[PDB]
Amino acid sequence: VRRLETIVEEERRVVVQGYVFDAEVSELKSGRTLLTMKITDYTNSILVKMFSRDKEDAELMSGVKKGMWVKVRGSVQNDTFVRDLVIIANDLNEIAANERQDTAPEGEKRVELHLHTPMSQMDAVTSVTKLIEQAKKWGHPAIAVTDHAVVQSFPEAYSAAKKHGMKVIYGLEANIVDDPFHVTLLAQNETGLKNLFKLVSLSHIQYFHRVPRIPRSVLVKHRDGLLVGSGCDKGELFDNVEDIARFYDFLEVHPPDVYKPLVKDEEMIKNIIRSIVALGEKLDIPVVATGNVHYLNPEDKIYRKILIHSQGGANPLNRHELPDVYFRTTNEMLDCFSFLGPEKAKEIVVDNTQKIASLIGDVKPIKDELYTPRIEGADEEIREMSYRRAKEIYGDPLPKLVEERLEKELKSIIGHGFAVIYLISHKLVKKSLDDGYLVGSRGSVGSSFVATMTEITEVNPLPPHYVCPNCKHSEFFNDGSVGSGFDLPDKNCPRCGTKYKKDGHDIPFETFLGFKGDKVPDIDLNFSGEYQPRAHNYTKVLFGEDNVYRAGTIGTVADKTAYGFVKAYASDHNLELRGAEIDRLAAGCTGVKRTTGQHPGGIIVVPDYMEIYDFTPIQYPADDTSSEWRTTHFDFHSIHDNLLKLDILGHDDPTVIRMLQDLSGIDPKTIPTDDPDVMGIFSSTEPLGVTPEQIMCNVGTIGIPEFGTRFVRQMLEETRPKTFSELVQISGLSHGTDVWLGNAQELIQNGTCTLSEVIGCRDDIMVYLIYRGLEPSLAFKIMESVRKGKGLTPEFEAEMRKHDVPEWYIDSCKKIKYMFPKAHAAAYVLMAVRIAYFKVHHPLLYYASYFTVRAEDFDLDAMIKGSAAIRKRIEEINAKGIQATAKEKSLLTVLEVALEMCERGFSFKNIDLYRSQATEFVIDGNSLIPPFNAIPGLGTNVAQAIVRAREEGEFLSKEDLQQRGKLSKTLLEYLESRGCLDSLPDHNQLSLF
DNA sequence: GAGACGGGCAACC
DNA sequence: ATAACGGTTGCCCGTCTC
Ligand SMILES: Nc1nc2c(ncn2[C@H]2C[C@H](O)[C@@H](COP(=O)(O)OP(=O)(O)OP(=O)(O)O)O2)c(=O)[nH]1
Ligand SMILES: [Mn+2]
Ligand SMILES: [Mn+2]
Ligand SMILES: [Mn+2]
Ligand SMILES: [Zn+2]
Ligand SMILES: [Zn+2]
Secondary structure (H helix, E strand, O other): OEOHHHOOOOEEEEEEEEEEEEEEEEEOOOOOEEEEEEEEOOOOEEEEEEEOOOHHHHHHHHHOOOOOEEEEEEEEEEEOOOOEEEEEEEEEEEEOOOOOOOOOOOOOOOOEOOEOOOOOOOOOOOOHHHHHHHHHHHOOOOEEEOOEOOOOOHHHHHHHHHHHOOOEEEEEEEEEEOOOEEEEEEEOOHHHHHHHHHHHHHHHOOOEOOOEOEEHHHHHHOOOOEEEEOOOOOEOOOOOOOOOHHHOOEEEEOOHHHHOOOOOOHHHHHHHHHHHHHHHHHOOOOEEEOOOEOEOOHHHHHHHHHHHHHOOOOOOOOOOOOOOOEOOOHHHHHHHOHHHOHHHHHHHHHHHHHHHHHOOOOOOOOOOOOOOOOOOOHHHHHHHHHHHHHHHHHOOOOOHHHHHHHHHHHHHHHHOOOHHHHHHHHHHHHHHHHOOOOOEEEHHHHHOHHHHHOOOOOOOOOOOEEEOOOOOOEEEOOOOOOOOHHHOOOOEOOOOOOEOEEEOOOOOOHHHHOOOOOOOOOEEEEEEOOOHHHHHHHHHHHHOHHHEEEEEEEEEOOHHHHHHHHHHHHHHOOOOOOHHHHHHHHHHHOOOEEEEEEEEEEEEEOOOOOOHHHOOOEEOHHHOOOOOOOEEOOOHHHHOOOOOEEEEEEEHHHHHHHHHHHHHOOOHHHOOOOOHHHHHOOOOOHHHOOOHHHHOOOOOOOOOOOOOOHHHHHHHHHHOOOOHHHHHHHHHHOOOOOOHHHHHHHHHHOOOOOHHHOOOOHHHHHHHHHHOOOOHHHHHHHHHHHHOOOOOOHHHHHHHHHOOOOHHHHHHHHHOOOOOOHHHHHHHHHHHHHHHHHHHHOHHHHHHHHHHHOOOOOOHHHHHHOHHHHHHHHHHHHOOHHHOOHHHHHHHHHHHHHHHHHHOOOEEOOOOOOOOOOOOOEEEOOEEEOOHHHOOOOOHHHHHHHHHHHHHOOOOOHHHHHHHHOOOHHHHHHHHHOOOOOOOOOOOOOOOO
16 A cells, blocks of 8 residues: 555556545546546545446446545556556555544543634635534533634634534634733623624724734733633744743643754754643643644645745744644643643543633634614605605606505515615615716616615516606506617607606515525625715715725735746745645645725614624734725625615726716717617627628627627627617526536527526526416525525425426526626626717727726737737747736727727827826827826826926927926837937927026 | 836626 | 626736846
8 A cells, every 4th residue: 555655657566545626527539537536545545547447437437436435556657648657556445544633532522722723814725614613523521722813713603512412612823012922712602602703803094014913012002802822832932931821721831743843853842842741830820731833733844844935034933834723632741741641631631621611601702693773864755755756757646566565575675674775775876976987787676666766777577568757657567578668769758758768677675685684694885986085985984984994905825826836836846746636735825815805885884773783793804004995804605694885886887887878978878778780790790881791790899898808799690689678688697607508508509498488587487487476485595596606406396396497497596607797787787888889989088988997907019010919929829728927818809899989980199298198098089099007017106297397298209208397218108119219309408597 | 216007817796 | 618797906926137
């Protein structure tokens, strides 16, 4: 039985063990089956191939899973396609993991009181879930979580606590400074827990230095409910006569090995530990043997080594070799301390450890319920706001339809405590408008007609209908035969003669709030990127400075970065590693916290009768103390269920159509949604006056948000939507993995159902399951499950089958990885159509707005040279296929729209010293003049300076332009070489004040 | 050696 | 071409310029 680190050359026969961390199966022309595994015994790893000799072995091959352990007897060959050595197996036996066993008697088990999770930035490697699971297996009565400076593992510890029935002790390793050493804080109760949240807040905010820190006095202030340990070798007392110690409720001692970096020798460490023992008995302070766990098993160490090493001589913990700090069993802990005698062994390893755990109650770090804000007048105001607005559109009294929609909608919104955020949402939209920035609708609030009446969405969820903007008469359609009111043919009020307005997308209110109101949705708004910060700030004014917080995020090491760290470490250590082994080192690194950041837009609202510390600590994103916003210490996901969120988002659609409006004088709300020429671009280039050959594309949607992508263009080619609601079906099908490809697309092509019958929004799942007989709340639950890509449980399938829901439909639900709500699809489609109207009728406005707002990657020389030149760049990038760099892809998107622009008869002029603007593409006859910031290296600040300076006074020489415009040599050259500066002298022979 | 700038990446909707 | 979910904010860090 060979360890995998000894497999080094081709070799006739080896027997090998290892965890299978990857397994796939494929079929050969011959009919034979091939199993391909990666396995590691944790000294190294290797790829393994096995060739089936019969269908019995072929199916056993399918039984091999990630997580199994396997003994393989095989040959070792160079595989020249995988470019590494590889085992060709003829023998595979599954085997026990036979892992470290905790052999002490039941009730005589150890409790770990000092332990680090992947949340100890770049320092610890095994997830808290795995650790807690291991403690459970070992029979530990409890386990502690004590991360450095943070409590970000709490949410996951809790979950695992409940799933596994393990008692968790919620703690902190804190940096205390006297008014810079380590202590262990263990929370005994909610008081303690809130004090923890507080201390981590103060340490990240008022007292952050290079590292979150806590003055001792502030610790004392917030000590109630905490047990304080003297902790580490970087502890106060280990770092040495006696008063210091009386400060701790417990005294820590690590296994002698853990201290090995140094002191004279192991015998002295051993002495120091014995004096801490002397001290503890002397002062009646329990002494505890703690592990300082930074990973599960002895071998997991290498992952910690790789992370730490990535930091460089900057961390200098790389100065010394790293201690064995794995999760030690209760029998092995005794072994480590056998030198103190068997009575003291048992005392500090189990009796005292157990005793400290006994002093800890059962704390719930994350709350169960939702706490909802109160602002006097709100329930009342949302009611009147919406009845008033509804009456002026639909008449007095209201049609039964509308009236019933409002009654049912309000009692839910009001009763489940959402009236406040509707209102705050309405003011945000109102102020943005008044400030000159229109707002784009998004997400599930468009399922709510009250939301429509409060002008928080442009989406009207009522069934399709005509309404007169004058006489107010209404015509609704519930035949279901008509998809969206926007599909209706233009018509006149048969009563006043006035031309009818059309609306209604037939969306059920429940998509938003469900039936129980056990769901907590949010309100999503698309503000323009330029405006987003201001909308954010307005919520401070509305709720008060201390009752809102930006949701914070935790940046972890994901695959690409992990791979990056491992390769470098290999390189620096001169290791030649196999793909398989690099893979497995990579995997052991992912999950580890590297930084913190900011939710892209969500603001979390704290009810005035609670406080943020009932829910999470707070801090600064990335620890920037000059940040305008404080962030939540837990991310939004951990507290999803406790506080409402306003998704105040940034998006280009509002900005673009704002510019389209400010350039044309046209009110986008007046734009028709059934303009044949506009809608034609979704299935043809005709409306654009160009050939498919001319623009290398069969449909007219280049540049159109969502629809301009290569994937979506292809979908359009095959579906040819013309109707608003057909576009809405496509919007749904084109967003989310396994929605179209391998799912709907096949169902349509098999003829197993029609385009319109295929599942195109989460709503249709609910509406159809109710139709088919199921209980609405259950139909809701099922919709919610598939649209989160969670598939179907057995109970769901059973309820579906029991109601004649066809197998192809059930099977289609199980595929969907993600899925729009109809209201979002309608909102986006409406936005895309408004823009399309400019693409078609005001092309230059469309392009000026596109390159101004959306593009950030150019090849200006190509663009200026024109059609043939652009085409050549594009073909260059096409040749690279899916081997194109993210940036080439970004550029390809923009060149595609340049080539189309040029073919439609327009063009690009060179940067122009006196006509170019800073950041905006301007219209000049049939051209666009590029702005300065389009030049590579020339970013916004310089662009703005060049314009400022020129407005202060024109440029008298290249030199003058360089000084006043703040231009580097390279940038100056850029302009020179292109003839931009030709009309200027290099320098002036005079200069005056 | 501090400050633009852009790429590369992670979180998120 | 293949297969293909689209689009947004924000942080780090190497690079290139004084
Ligand atoms: N293309 C795409 N769009 C998304 C994705 N996630 C969210 N969005 C868009 C569509 C959603 O309706 C909206 C995201 O809103 P939320 O995350 O608040 O969820 P949504 O509002 O759909 O449901 P909710 O009722 O809030 O639980 O933005 C995604 O993975 N892909
Ligand atoms: Mn420590
Ligand atoms: Mn520690
Ligand atoms: Mn939402
Ligand atoms: Zn540590
Ligand atoms: Zn009328």
